[PDB]
Amino acid sequence: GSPPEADPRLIESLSQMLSMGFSDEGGWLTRLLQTKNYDIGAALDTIQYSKH
Numbered sequence: 001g002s003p004p005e006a007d008p009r010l011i012e013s014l015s016q017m018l019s020m021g022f023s024d025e026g027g028w029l030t031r032l033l034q035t036k037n038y039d040i041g042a043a044l045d046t047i048q049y050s051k052h
Contacts, residue, residue: 007046010042010043013036014046022047029044
């Protein structure tokens with residue numbers, strides 16, 4: 001569902017990308033999101049891979 005620290009701070013870094021409605025499949029964003037110290041897989045997974 002909605003996890004604290006595993007959704008906001010994650011879905012935020014996307015605020016920069018999600019502004020279109022697409023996830024980074026070319027590893028381009030991954031590097032960025034990595035700024036969080038973990039993985040965008042979990043982040044990019046919010047731009048779609050789930051429910052609109």
